[PDB]
Design a protein around this ligand. Structure first.
Ligand SMILES: *[C@@H]1O[C@H](CO)[C@@H](O[C@@H]2O[C@H](CO)[C@@H](O)[C@H](O)[C@H]2NC(C)=O)[C@H](O)[C@H]1NC(C)=O
Ligand SMILES: *[C@@H]1O[C@H](CO)[C@@H](O)[C@H](O)[C@H]1NC(C)=O
Ligand SMILES: *[C@@H]1O[C@H](CO)[C@@H](O)[C@H](O)[C@H]1NC(C)=O
Ligand SMILES: *[C@@H]1O[C@H](CO)[C@@H](O)[C@H](O)[C@H]1NC(C)=O
Ligand SMILES: *[C@@H]1O[C@H](CO)[C@@H](O)[C@H](O)[C@H]1NC(C)=O
Ligand SMILES: *[C@@H]1O[C@H](CO)[C@@H](O)[C@H](O)[C@H]1NC(C)=O
Ligand SMILES: *[C@@H]1O[C@H](CO)[C@@H](O)[C@H](O)[C@H]1NC(C)=O
Ligand SMILES: *[C@@H]1O[C@H](CO)[C@@H](O)[C@H](O)[C@H]1NC(C)=O
Ligand SMILES: *[C@@H]1O[C@H](CO)[C@@H](O)[C@H](O)[C@H]1NC(C)=O
Ligand SMILES: *[C@@H]1O[C@H](CO)[C@@H](O)[C@H](O)[C@H]1NC(C)=O
Lengths: 48, 313, 227, 122, 86, 22
């Protein structure tokens, strides 16, 4: 509970009236992608 | 009151690395630390000159004391300039100068913009203005008025009527002369009179000494001299010791600049107080009960000092 | 009233011209803005600094080194950036102390100049203070201090007191001033010659105790009345 | 052109005996300014010299006056900056963030100081 | 595109949200940097399109509390966050 | 008009806006 997190930040079980910057927020990635060029120059092992 | 510090500059490479080129190459990897160091030191240096101008350059034009230095019994020879000495300072100013006692591997002291002679001329202008005109030259165009009438104004400023002066001009003049004369005797006999302004010079020299002495510290490295590290060890593990020494010396220099900024804040406060006292005590009479010294204020006189100002309240 | 009002109007009008033409009139607030911007820029710049590490980017450190070997590089980068941020905090604290001093001065000037009138010399501007006006600024306050300055001064001869009937008279206000032929009482900051009478002078002692005393008539308005 | 000053040796400027209110301060009472076509160094001028006419019996009194307006500028506040330890220190990466915990309560101190500054501005 | 994703463009590992850009790279510039060397923009290796690298949404959260002595209700302030998202 | 002006660094807005200061 953000009140519980505020209590932890103050290291107290009672929180006085006010505004407390308890922690930070950040959005995690949804997935992963990779980009590369048209790497298609196959070695001559195929023809060998 | 202290008004300024000793303008100091530190050369990173000469301090951290000395004459070592290999160390100088490594120091680049630590970024803009030295840019911040030199910018802060330059800011402090410019602030010293700003404080000096704000204290002493309050009068726009230099007033000259009249050739006939008679002021109805009042005697300012002890505070007015003496032509005999090469620098035209007053006797009390000379004693103040005498009493205050005053590139080593990257540490240097830059000179102030205003020379001691220029500050003496500024003080002489402030004096001549005060004795000849009173508070008029602080509000606008200076207007001459004999010192007897300026003093009558000033008594009327403390509730005492004018007639108290004219009916007792001679006794008051003698009292003022004796009070002025006792100042040199008190200063000469009391060697600790100027501690408040000797302390800043002492702290600056002491900070410089601790900065210089800390180079001997090994900071946990094998040796405190970079040349031995570079000669004894090959670059791979030599770089580890050089990193330790460089980190230690950067930390010491950063601490030095932080202390310089903290002390510059106090000196800036002192210079602001000095300017306020100049304005409210020399360019006028202060109803502020205890600002221009103890007791009901009459007037004050400034005297130059190596890094401050002395007010004869 | 008309001349003074016109002078005030002209000065207020010229304030805008002075502000716009001047290249760095607002230099002090721009200094705070530049200090903050430079502090942030240098703090960001330190991120690219390697601090003796093989690289200043954490991903390469974690990529081309084993965790046991990369731990020293990570420790170096972390300690360097922590030191940089601590230096930033210390500089912010020092500049905040300076800003607090400036804000206390601004509040005192508001209270004295704007909410009252200041007898302090050179506090509410240069000159005999009348009043001041506050103007909002992005990170400061601009004070339009209104001041009074003497002009068109003229020489005169004076004596400390006027002796009449064997007794010395002294002025309630101003000075005893004469152009050379007639003696008048005048207020200090604006030439307003008054006729010398008992109304504007008080007696104190006999005349031989005053240096430079002079003689002149001191009319008594009751005598013409002859009640 | 070379000139010697207590602050050091100056090259590229000509010393002139004239005294002007100066622009660029060099030190030891020496300044420099653009002559107009050349750079000139000179001793500072502390303003005009005015032997105000003192006498034991003379006064000067204003017969007129002017009411003038001047602008004073004082900063009152500064930007309220906030800093995130993890992102700045190591760019919001998990491996680095895990190690950063070992350094203790530095961030609490720094953020407390910054919040105090922010509240002080208000 | 248009959502937070871990990206690798012929190297240049990073995380952010990808959007099409109007900045015109020269025929030889692969990626761009803003002031202080932030990887502001990148060119797609395959499509040769120009994409910005915008950091994922972040900000501090502050809890408004009327005093635990008064009540346990609280309001949370997401500093710098637009209500169009979390 | 005369005076004019992430990586974890952000600027909070002041409590008093320009309109309220005016
Ligand atoms: C007020 O005090 C002053 C200072 O003590 C007195 O002036 C002294 O008077 C004595 C006796 O006449 C002289 O010997 C001293 O030389 C005076 N001092 C100075 C500095 O001139 C003054 O007499 C006192 N006035 C009254 C009415 O008692
Ligand atoms: C002023 O005082 C000094 C020191 O007491 C003295 O030498 C000098 O003669 C005095 N001057 C006059 C004009 O009384
Ligand atoms: C008074 O007369 C002197 C001598 O002529 C002159 O230098 C000075 O400027 C005069 N003062 C005024 C206020 O006119
Ligand atoms: C001085 O002023 C008085 C004012 O009544 C005038 O009568 C007199 O002629 C003036 N004298 C001189 C010398 O200007
Ligand atoms: C004033 O008048 C008295 C009596 O006539 C005389 O003794 C005294 O010398 C006069 N003073 C001046 C300054 O003329
Ligand atoms: C400046 O004055 C000195 C001393 O009189 C003189 O030797 C020198 O030639 C002067 N310089 C110029 C450029 O006039
Ligand atoms: C006032 O000064 C003048 C000029 O020095 C002088 O002649 C005169 O005697 C002085 N006044 C007195 C009362 O001594
Ligand atoms: C890669 O191949 C695709 C499909 O043929 C093509 O659309 C794209 O332009 C190619 N990119 C390059 C850099 O050749
Ligand atoms: C809780 O404490 C605060 C701070 O003393 C006070 O303002 C408030 O009224 C208290 N609430 C209650 C319900 O007592
Ligand atoms: C929040 O986002 C919406 C939609 O993009 C936009 O209309 C609004 O102006 C934004 N508000 C703020 C404060 O950025």
């Amino acid at each position: 509970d953000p009140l519980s997190e505020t209590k932890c930040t103050l290291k107290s079980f009672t929180v006085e009236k006010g505004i407390y910057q308890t922690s930070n927020f950040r959005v995690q990635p949804t997935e992963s992608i990779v980009r590369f060029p048209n790497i298609t120059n196959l070695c001559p092992f195929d023809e060998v | 009151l202290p008004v300024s510090m000793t303008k100091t500059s530190v050369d990173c490479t000469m301090y951290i690395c000395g004459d070592s080129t290999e160390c100088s190459n490594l120091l680049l990897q630590y970024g803009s630390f030295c840019t911040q160091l030199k910018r802060a030191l330059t800011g402090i240096a410019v602030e010293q000159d700003k404080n000096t101008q704000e204290v002493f350059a309050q009068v726009k034009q230099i007033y000259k004391t009249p050739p006939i230095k008679y002021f109805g019994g009042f005697n300012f020879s002890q505070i007015l300039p003496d032509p005999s000495k090469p620098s035209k300072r007053s006797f009390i100013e000379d004693l103040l100068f005498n009493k205050v006692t005053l590139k080593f591997k990257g540490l240097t002291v830059l000179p102030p913009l205003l020379t001691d002679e220029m500050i003496a001329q500024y003080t002489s202008a402030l004096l001549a203005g005060t004795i000849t005109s009173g508070w008029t030259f602080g509000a606008g165009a200076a207007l001459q008025i004999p010192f007897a009438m300026q003093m009558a104004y000033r008594f009327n400023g403390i509730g005492v009527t004018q007639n108290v002066l004219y009916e007792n001009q001679k006794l008051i003049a003698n009292q003022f002369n004796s009070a002025i004369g006792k100042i040199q005797d008190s200063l000469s006999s009391t060697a600790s009179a100027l501690g408040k302004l000797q302390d800043v010079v002492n702290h600056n020299a002491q900070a410089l000494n601790t900065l210089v002495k800390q180079l001997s510290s090994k900071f946990g490295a094998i040796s405190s001299v970079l040349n031995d590290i570079f000669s004894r060890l090959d670059p791979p593990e030599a770089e580890v010791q050089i990193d330790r020494l460089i980190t230690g010396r950067l930390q010491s220099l950063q601490t030095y600049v932080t202390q310089q900024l903290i002390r510059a804040a106090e000196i800036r406060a002192s210079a602001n107080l000095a300017a306020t006292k100049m304005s409210e005590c020399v360019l006028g009479q202060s109803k502020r009960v205890d600002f221009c010294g103890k007791g009901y204020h009459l007037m004050s006189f400034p005297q130059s000092a190596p890094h401050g100002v002395v007010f004869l309240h | 009233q008309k001349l003074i009002a016109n002078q005030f109007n002209s000065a207020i009008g010229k304030i805008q011209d002075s502000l716009s033409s001047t290249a760095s009139a607002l230099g002090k607030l721009q200094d705070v803005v530049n200090h903050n911007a430079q502090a942030l820029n240098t703090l960001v710049k330190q991120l690219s600094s390697k601090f003796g590490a093989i690289s200043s980017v954490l991903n390469d450190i974690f990529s081309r080194l084993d965790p046991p070997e990369a731990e020293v590089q990570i420790d170096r980068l972390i300690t360097g950036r922590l030191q940089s941020l601590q230096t930033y905090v210390t500089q912010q604290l020092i500049r905040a102390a300076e800003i607090r001093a400036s804000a206390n001065l601004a509040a005192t000037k508001m209270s004295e100049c704007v909410l009252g009138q200041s007898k302090r010399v050179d506090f509410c501007g240069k000159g005999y203070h009348l009043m001041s006006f506050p103007q909002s600024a992005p990170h400061g306050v601009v004070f339009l201090h209104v001041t009074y300055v003497p002009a068109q001064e003229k020489n005169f001869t004076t004596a400390p007191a006027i002796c009449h009937d064997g007794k010395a008279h002294f002025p309630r206000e101003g000075v005893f001033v004469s152009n050379g032929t007639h003696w008048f009482v005048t207020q200090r900051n604006f030439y307003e010659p008054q006729i010398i009478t008992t109304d504007n002078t008080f007696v104190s002692g006999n005349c031989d105790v005053v240096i430079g005393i002079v003689n002149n008539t001191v009319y008594d308005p009751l005598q013409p009345e002859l009640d | 052109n070379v000139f010697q000053t207590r602050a050091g040796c100056l090259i590229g400027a000509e010393y002139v005996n004239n005294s002007y209110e100066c622009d660029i301060p060099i030190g030891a009472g020496i300044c420099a300014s653009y002559q107009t076509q050349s750079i000139i160094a000179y001793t500072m001028s502390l303003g005009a010299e005015n032997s105000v006419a003192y006498s034991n019996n003379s006064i000067a009194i204003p017969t007129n006056f002017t009411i003038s307006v001047t602008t004073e500028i004082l900063p009152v506040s500064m930007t309220k900056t906030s800093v995130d330890c993890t992102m700045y220190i190591c760019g919001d990466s998990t491996e680095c963030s895990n190690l950063l915990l070992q350094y203790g309560s530095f961030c609490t101190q720094l953020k407390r100081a910054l919040t105090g500054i922010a509240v002080e501005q208000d | 595109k248009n959502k937070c994703v871990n990206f690798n463009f012929n190297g240049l590992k990073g995380t952010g949200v990808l959007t099409e850009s109007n900045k015109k790279f020269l025929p030889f510039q692969q990626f761009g940097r803003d002031i202080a060397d932030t990887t502001d923009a990148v060119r797609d290796p395959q499509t040769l399109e120009i994409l910005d690298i915008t950091p994922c949404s972040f900000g501090g959260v502050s809890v408004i509390t009327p005093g635990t002595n008064t009540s346990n209700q609280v309001a949370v302030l997401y500093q710098g966050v637009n209500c169009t998202e979390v």
